[PDB]
Amino acid sequence: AYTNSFTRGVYYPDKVFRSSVLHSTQDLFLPFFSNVTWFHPVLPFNDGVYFASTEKSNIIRGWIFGTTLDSKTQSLLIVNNATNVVIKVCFRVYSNCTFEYVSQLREFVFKNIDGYFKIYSKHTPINLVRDLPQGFSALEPLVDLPIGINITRFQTLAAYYVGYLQPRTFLLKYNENGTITDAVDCALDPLSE
Amino acid sequence: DSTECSNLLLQYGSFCTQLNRALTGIAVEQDKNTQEVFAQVKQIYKTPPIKDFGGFNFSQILPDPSKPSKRSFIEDLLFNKVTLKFNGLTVLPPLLTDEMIAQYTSALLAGTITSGWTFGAGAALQIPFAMQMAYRFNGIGVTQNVLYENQKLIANQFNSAIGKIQDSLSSTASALGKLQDVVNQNAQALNTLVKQLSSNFGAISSVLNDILSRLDPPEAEVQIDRLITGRLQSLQTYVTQQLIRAAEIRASANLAATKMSECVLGQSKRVDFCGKGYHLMSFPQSAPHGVVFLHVTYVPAQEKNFTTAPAICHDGKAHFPREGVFVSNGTHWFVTQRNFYEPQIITTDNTFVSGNCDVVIGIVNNTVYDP
Amino acid sequence: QIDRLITGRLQSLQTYVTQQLIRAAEIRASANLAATKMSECVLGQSKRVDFCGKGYHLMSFPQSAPHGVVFLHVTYVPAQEKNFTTAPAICHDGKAHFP
Amino acid sequence: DSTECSNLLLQYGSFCTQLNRALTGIAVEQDKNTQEVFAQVKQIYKTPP
Amino acid sequence: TKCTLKSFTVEKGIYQTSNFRVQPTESIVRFPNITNLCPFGEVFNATRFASVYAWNRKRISNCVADYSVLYNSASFSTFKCYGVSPTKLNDLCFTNVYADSFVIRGDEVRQIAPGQTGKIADYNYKLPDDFTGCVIAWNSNNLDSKVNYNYLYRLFRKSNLKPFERDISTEIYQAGSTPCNGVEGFNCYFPLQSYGFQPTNGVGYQPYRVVVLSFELLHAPATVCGPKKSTNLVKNKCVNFNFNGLTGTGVLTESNKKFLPFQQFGRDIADTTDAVRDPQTLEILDITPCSFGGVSVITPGTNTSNQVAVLYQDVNCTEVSNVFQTRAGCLIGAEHVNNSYECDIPIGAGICASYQTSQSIIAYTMSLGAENSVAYSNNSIAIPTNFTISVTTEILPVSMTKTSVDCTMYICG
Ligand SMILES: *[C@@]1(O)O[C@H](CO)[C@]2(O[C@@]3(O[C@H](CO)[C@@]4(O[C@]5(O[C@H](CO)[C@@H](O)[C@]6(O[C@@]7(O[C@H](CO)[C@@H](O)[C@H](O)[C@@H]7O)O6)[C@@H]5O)O4)[C@H](O)[C@H]3NC(C)=O)O2)[C@H](O)[C@H]1NC(C)=O
Ligand SMILES: CC(=O)N[C@H]1[C@H](O)O[C@H](CO)[C@]2(O[C@@]3(O[C@H](CO)[C@@]4(O[C@]5(O[C@H](CO)[C@@H](O)[C@]6(O[C@@]7(O[C@H](CO)[C@@H](O)[C@H](O)[C@@H]7O)O6)[C@@H]5O)O4)[C@H](O)[C@H]3NC(C)=O)O2)[C@@H]1O
Ligand SMILES: *[C@@]1(O)O[C@H](CO)[C@]2(O[C@@]3(O[C@H](CO)[C@]4(O[C@@]5(O[C@H](CO)[C@@H](O)[C@H](O)[C@@H]5O)O4)[C@H](O)[C@H]3NC(C)=O)O2)[C@H](O)[C@H]1NC(C)=O
Ligand SMILES: CC(=O)N[C@@H]1[C@@H](O)[C@H](O[C@]2(O)O[C@H](CO)[C@]3(O[C@@]4(O[C@H](CO)[C@@H](O)[C@H](O)[C@@H]4O)O3)[C@H](O)[C@H]2NC(C)=O)[C@@H](CO)O[C@H]1O
Ligand SMILES: *[C@@]1(O)O[C@H](CO)[C@]2(O[C@@]3(O[C@H](CO)[C@@H](O)[C@H](O)[C@H]3NC(C)=O)O2)[C@H](O)[C@H]1NC(C)=O
Ligand SMILES: *[C@@]1(O)O[C@H](CO)[C@]2(O[C@@]3(O[C@H](CO)[C@@H](O)[C@H](O)[C@H]3NC(C)=O)O2)[C@H](O)[C@H]1NC(C)=O
Ligand SMILES: *[C@@]1(O)O[C@H](CO)[C@]2(O[C@@]3(O[C@H](CO)[C@@H](O)[C@H](O)[C@H]3NC(C)=O)O2)[C@H](O)[C@H]1NC(C)=O
Ligand SMILES: CC(=O)N[C@H]1[C@H](O)O[C@H](CO)[C@]2(O[C@@]3(O[C@H](CO)[C@@H](O)[C@H](O)[C@H]3NC(C)=O)O2)[C@@H]1O
Ligand SMILES: CC(=O)N[C@H]1[C@H](O)O[C@H](CO)[C@]2(O[C@@]3(O[C@H](CO)[C@@H](O)[C@H](O)[C@H]3NC(C)=O)O2)[C@@H]1O
Ligand SMILES: CC(=O)N[C@H]1[C@H](O)O[C@H](CO)[C@]2(O[C@@]3(O[C@H](CO)[C@@H](O)[C@H](O)[C@H]3NC(C)=O)O2)[C@@H]1O
Ligand SMILES: *[C@@]1(O)O[C@H](CO)[C@@H](O)[C@H](O)[C@H]1NC(C)=O
Ligand SMILES: *[C@@]1(O)O[C@H](CO)[C@@H](O)[C@H](O)[C@H]1NC(C)=O
Ligand SMILES: *[C@@]1(O)O[C@H](CO)[C@@H](O)[C@H](O)[C@H]1NC(C)=O
Ligand SMILES: CC(=O)N[C@@H]1[C@@H](O)[C@H](O)[C@@H](CO)O[C@H]1O
């Protein structure tokens, strides 16, 4: 039950600030109008992954990342919880702890670059259900942990879109504030090219 | 401001005194260009207090005291039309301030309005503007009475034509294409020159303090050398681009100086040099990085077909026109100036006599009235 | 070591020849202007103003210089101006006379 | 058409972009030259038969 | 200028003799609050330690280790580091840090070192030959000696321990040919003994608590780094600064631009750092390159005089006879006049300097030309009554020297 990934799905590349300037960035992104595999389980992690979920009753919980998830090698086990979000390298679902971290439409972007896990999230006042409307938003609230393994599983525990990032350059327009108001995709179309 | 890089650069040689010398050369060349183009007036000419230039209206191109910049309305429009200190790059201010250039053009304009072309030759000798326009019509071949009989119409045409320029400048975008292109090219050159710093150039890292910090000096020397050679190459490229573009702009500035001389200061017979049509006069306006010439030209219109003859054969001799052309409306023959149809009775006074009838081909029999 | 020396000396020779090309282009512009002056101001009388001296051009003479040419422009400069009252036409017997 | 060379070339910077821009400027200037020299006539004129 | 022109006589003009950059003072460094610190306290002040045969290993991760607490302490008997400088790793990071703690006796501390042999080094705790780390030990007679802890060590083993190996098996050691049946007997011994830690023992026989920090530094991510000193900031003073690993020289000032809660430092254009937020106070600052510009002298020519007027380009000269600010920079040593003359030496921004009388260099706003208002009227004409013929000189270069460079003889020879 695929559905085109629209304009949405772009994140802030780096920490820097840019005011009213156009920039070109070369790293993993989610392609414009790329049919993501809406799930209504099992999901691979060939590369960085855009995860977008809508829950009226907030059924979905944290993501159980794992390279093997056979208890032989360390997992990542992002979970979330009313009071706090807890993530450990180590309820109903189960399967040498290295590191644990505890801290505080629903855009989510997860990627692993040179062993560093990065998370980008956004909250939107959605008004139309069962479709992600083409629009623009991004942020970088993240937690970095030096795992150094290639995650390949999601096992998210009431439907979520999932798309795969690809290494294609983008041109991002910057607002006066420094936020990314708009972007265009270089290889999407000859006009955008 | 890195000392070890300073030494490694020092060992390359005299490249930088050479680059600085080239850049300072083009820098002073720019001032020479502006001064050569605009400073063709010996002494700044004030315009008279009351403007009664025979019905012609110069309010738009003449300076207005109310404005603080003391530049004409069209000059301010041209300034608004265009839209014009990081690491070792400095922009030196032009020797002639914009106000000084406006004053130059105001002086030239007052001189050409009041004294015609006399001020370019020497002392400024004043003629009533109507009589000067008659001089210029004689210059383009039309007799001077044509202006005086039609002075109000010519004034209205000139005023409305100047009015059209204001609409063209204010509304039509990218009117000042060449000047804006100059500004954009210079901004592009400086911007790419600054961008080259971030480039790696084959070293481990672009930022020089970092390459210094995390390697031993013997090993760091090689990476620093790669950075230096790359940056020096980029700077040399920028300098040579500037040299060539400065040559092109010098050619354009020499052309502007020649047009200022040959068209503002005097009337020119070079066809299509200043405008389309027979050239009457031209006015200079100061744009930000250049000069804008308003060319007042005379273009004939509403032509009429006529039957013509090379000479009139009367009493066994051929009469040729002194300055006109024989024209026939079907039954009568007249002598008219070529540029303006103003017929006159063929007479011995305005037609000279040479030879006899038989030799010249195409002549027509008629009577040449003798006063 | 000879590689480093070759690269440096080659870069220096290259920048020298490029600057020589640009300077030669400037000198060619100047020489074309001098030929135009020698043709329009020595071989004839020129009406285009301030091309050859300040004032109305009478004539001009060339003189050989070491790496160039020096024109002596003979021009006519009006002086000792006098004021006069003026008028475009003259009415006589009901007809306008223009000079 | 070697990717290994192209990645190394990226480090040098905007040299290729600069060269392409200079050459395309020369290219459009040539059309401008021919247009300026020959397109002096508003409307094509035919000689009488 | 005589130096940079390679002459003892320079002509009238303005020459860019050098460049002038304000030098930075009192460089500053800043790094965010050290809120999270490494648990060396729960390793060193652990109430109970561990027997040397079952030595305890503590993995240090995801923390900032202030090693100064260790070597500035005056309560250690031995602090032997191998292949690493404890005073030099407070600005260093490690891919892996291990902390091994156990208890031995005095004459056995010398065995906790690479290339050693003995009961402890062969059967309990072995360090590799290329060991990188520190061996820290101190007397623990007041804690591990009463008249109720039970510390053990291994007596025998069929082979020596590999580095960082740990054997806790309590199987009977077979010393002879006959095989034991999990029971002690002839040529069969239990492999563990207790230490006889009596408070009245000799110093070499009293217990010593030992901590062995070992480090690894591969081309891999790291999580154990030491603390970073930070100092107060300045304003409106050209300073070399370090903000969160970003080094730069400039004048820091208050900035109206607002970052977003995640953005650290900003670049206005062309990848040049123009703003930066300090990690401590969470405040944005704007960086401006502290004033720099060419210094160029104005001289009327040596033979005329030896006076010079310095011009520091585009520098508001509140800093280094009469000092006159001009729109082209600062002028030192040139009197400013009110009247105006024709331009002699181009300074810039509509200002020229010249040498005139006593005998001083004066800077003035150049005069464009004389002012006259030719008397226009609608019926007035000015007719020349005489004339002067004038010959003028126009000089034009037409050629250059035909130089020819032998490429090969110049390059190689
Ligand atoms: C035309 O428009 O301009 C020319 C300018 O060259 C004009 O010619 C000048 O006329 C002067 C008046 O006669 C001339 O000055 C005198 O020349 C005689 C020699 O012929 C000389 O002896 C003279 O000096 C004596 O008188 C003066 C004045 O009284 C006195 O101060 C002396 O101490 C001495 O006693 O000296 C005068 O110098 O002046 C000029 O020589 C003469 N210039 C030339 C090149 O010939 O010519 C025209 O007269 C003038 N035309 C018109 C119609 O205005
Ligand atoms: C376009 C036009 O009107 N052209 C006129 C010009 O305006 O005025 C000239 C002056 O008269 C006009 O020249 C005349 O041209 C005639 C045509 O050639 C000319 O007629 C002949 O000339 C012969 C030369 O002497 C003459 O022998 C000729 O007469 C014979 O032929 C005629 C027939 O053509 C017979 O009728 C006669 O009886 C006789 O047999 O005589 C003609 O006289 O005609 C006139 O002589 C020309 N006039 C003069 C003064 O030379 O030139 C011109 O056509
Ligand atoms: C930020 O980066 O961008 C925003 C949007 O472009 C920017 O917000 C606006 O800024 C205006 C001027 O600061 C604001 O005008 C004022 O608003 C006051 C109430 O908020 C009002 O009392 C004033 O009279 C005035 O009208 O105008 C806008 O309100 C404001 N928009 C909002 C808050 O939605 O926002 C903002 O300025 C800019 N950040 C900075 C630091 O400039
Ligand atoms: C000032 C003046 O009156 N000049 C006239 C001149 O206009 C006229 O020549 C034309 O003027 O030329 C056109 C060519 O476009 C010509 O017209 C033709 O008409 C036929 C049909 O009638 C079309 O099929 C052709 O394609 C062409 O358009 O028009 C014709 O020669 C003139 N047109 C007119 C008079 O309307 C010449 C004619 O000798 O006379 C000058 O005095
Ligand atoms: C010309 O014929 O008449 C002008 C007006 O009378 C003359 O210009 C004035 O001359 C007087 C005396 O030289 C000056 O004091 C005025 O400033 C000057 N300008 C005015 C009144 O606007 O102008 C002018 O000099 C005169 N020309 C000649 C050649 O005599
Ligand atoms: C840093 O770690 O520690 C500072 C020391 O207190 C802390 O600074 C305080 O910040 C609050 C925020 O408004 C001010 O109200 C206090 O006056 C100020 N106190 C001092 C002594 O500076 O500074 C700072 O907030 C804190 N930063 C972080 C990120 O923990
Ligand atoms: C200079 O040429 O012109 C100045 C014009 O401002 C002059 O400065 C003024 O001098 C008068 C008289 O002393 C004062 O009453 C004004 O306040 C003063 N104005 C300013 C802005 O300073 O300044 C100045 O005196 C004058 N100097 C000379 C040597 O002529
Ligand atoms: C209902 C509830 O609070 N559930 C858990 C919540 O979602 O997460 C925290 C994780 O921090 C959980 O509490 C932890 O429980 C373990 C087990 O006893 C303790 O070791 C932790 O200290 C404790 N953490 C906190 C922050 O309370 O609590 C909740 O059970
Ligand atoms: C003598 C004369 O009338 N000169 C006019 C000059 O040639 O053109 C300007 C510009 O239009 C003219 O000034 C404007 O005149 C109109 C009257 O029709 C006024 O309504 C305008 O306010 C006035 N100024 C402008 C800027 O338009 O001025 C002169 O009158
Ligand atoms: C075909 C035609 O009408 N031709 C005219 C020609 O082009 O001009 C002459 C001169 O004006 C014209 O002849 C004159 O016309 C005026 C018209 O107002 C009459 O008043 C004159 O009587 C008449 N004849 C003369 C002046 O001898 O002739 C032609 O009509
Ligand atoms: C503590 O237990 O260990 C510290 C070393 O990490 C030491 O510096 C400190 O003094 C100890 N605390 C005490 C003795 O109270
Ligand atoms: C020069 O300025 O000074 C010399 C004395 O040191 C003198 O001989 C020479 O003539 C002077 N030059 C000029 C042009 O006056
Ligand atoms: C000068 O540069 O700095 C002064 C204090 O910083 C200030 O008062 C003065 O106005 C400034 N002048 C200029 C020309 O910038
Ligand atoms: C068998 C295995 O993988 N053991 C790992 C070890 O290699 C790693 O160095 C350590 C880091 O904390 O974590 C252990 O679980």
Numbering used by the authors:
A (entry chain C): 1 to 40, 56 to 105, 131 to 135, 139 to 147, 163 to 215, 237 to 272
B (entry chain C): 719 to 802, 828 to 1114
C (entry chain A): 965 to 1063
D (entry chain B): 566 to 614
E (entry chain A): 272 to 418, 421 to 593, 613 to 649, 662 to 717
Task: Give sentences from the paper.
SARS-CoV-2 infects target cells through the interaction of the viral spike (S) protein with cell receptors. In the following, we describe the analysis of SARS-CoV-2 spike stabilized in the prefusion state by two proline substitutions in S2 (S-2P). Using a new consensus-based image-processing approach together with principal component analysis, the flexibility and conformational dynamics of the SARS-CoV-2 spike in the prefusion state have been analysed. These studies revealed concerted motions involving the receptor-binding domain (RBD), N-terminal domain, and subdomains 1 and 2 around the previously characterized 1-RBD-up state, which have been modeled as elastic deformations.
The original images that were part of the ensemble map went through a ‘consensus classification’ procedure aimed at separating them into two algorithmically stable classes. Essentially, and as described in more detail in Section 2, we performed two independent classifications, further selecting those particles that were consistently together throughout the two classifications. The number of images in each class was reduced to 45 000 in one case and 21 000 in the other, with global FSC-based resolutions of 3.1 and 3.3 Å, respectively. Using maximum-likelihood-based classification, we have obtained two maps that are projected at the extremes of the main principal component on which flexible fitting from the ensemble map has been performed. However, these extreme maps have an intrinsic blurring in the most flexible areas, since for any class that we may define the images come from a continuum of states and are therefore heterogeneous. The open and closed structures depict a clear and concerted movement of the ‘thumb’ formed by the RBD and sub­domains 1 and 2 (SD1 and SD2) and the NTD of an adjacent chain. Within the approximation to modeling that a flexible fitting represents, we can appreciate two hinge movements of the RBD–SD1–SD2 domains: one located between amino acids 318–326 and 588–595 that produces most of the displacement, and the other between amino acids 330–335 and 527–531 that accompanies a less pronounced ‘up’ movement of the RBD. Additionally, the approach taken to define the two algorithmically stable ‘classes’ has clearly partitioned the data set according to the main axis of variance, PC1, since the projections of the maps of these classes fall almost exclusively along PC1 and are located towards the extremes of the image-projection cloud.
